[PDB]
């Protein structure tokens, strides 16, 4: 039920930053995030935990949603020529330096 | 019809206006925001304005 | 940031952004033809609005 407790907690806060419903593709952010790769997929359990991360950071932990970063792509040498290992989530500062370099899985 | 009904059904219009006209995203900012202060602008003036501009 | 301007419709020229090597590796919306404006003569920004634009 904790898979549903995540959205039970995340749909009772006034400051709407992320939305989780476990229904057909109900995942969006405030756009104050620097979102670059298109969400609204809900592919796997990754998205729910990532949204709970966003809720835990923007609220409670007191980080500005403008500072954060989601699904950042970087071009490295790479095991595969197309994957371009992508930062799952990140918390920068006012100078642009990544403070929290967070990778979130299922 | 009671001026309060006019106030409510115009504030509904204005709140719906701050989603496509002024495209305000924060749903909490959509609330706590009204057409008139109800104290600086008496409701009778709003009724007269509606009558003139309807 | 250029991503903060969303209209509702599809053509939103004031939304795209891209880094520019010749300009501090920062965002550039190279799409506007002319710029006419009358900027304020004295902007004294907030202690927290200052930090968000550096």
TrEMBL record, chain A:
Domain of life: Bacteria
Protein name, entry field: Uncharacterized protein
Whole-protein residues included: 3 to 108 of 916
Location of the Type I restriction enzyme R protein N-terminal domain: 46-106
TrEMBL record, chain C:
Taxonomic lineage: Bacteria, Bacillati, Bacillota, Bacilli, Bacillales
Full protein stretch here: 486 to 539 of 916
Species for this entry: Geobacillus thermocatenulatus
Name of the molecule in the record: Uncharacterized protein
Domain of life the protein comes from: Bacteria
């Amino acid at each position: 039920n904790w898979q549903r407790i995540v959205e039970a907690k995340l749909e009772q806060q006034k400051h709407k930053v992320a939305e989780i419903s476990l229904e057909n593709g109900t995942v969006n952010y405030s756009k104050k995030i620097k979102h670059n790769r298109n969400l609204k997929a809900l592919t796997g359990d990754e998205e729910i935990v990532r949204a709970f991360l966003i809720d835990r950071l923007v609220n409670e932990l007191d980080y500005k949603p403008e500072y954060l970063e989601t699904e950042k792509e970087y071009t490295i040498k790479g095991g595969h020529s197309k994957i371009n290992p992508r930062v799952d989530v990140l918390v920068k500062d006012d100078k642009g330096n990544p403070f929290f370099f967070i990778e979130v899985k299922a | 019809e009671s001026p309060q009904k006019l106030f409510d059904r115009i504030n509904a219009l204005y709140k719906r206006a701050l989603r496509e006209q002024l495209n305000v995203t924060d749903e909490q900012k959509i609330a706590e925001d009204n057409v008139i202060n109800r104290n600086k602008f008496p409701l009778n003036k709003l009724v007269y304005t509606v009558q003139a501009l309807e | 940031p250029f991503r903060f301007y969303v209209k509702e419709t599809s053509p939103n020229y004031l939304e795209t952004a891209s880094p520019d090597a010749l300009y501090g590796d920062k965002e550039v919306n190279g799409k506007f033809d002319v710029v006419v404006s009358n900027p304020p003569f004295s902007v004294d920004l907030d202690t927290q609005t200052q930090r968000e634009v550096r």
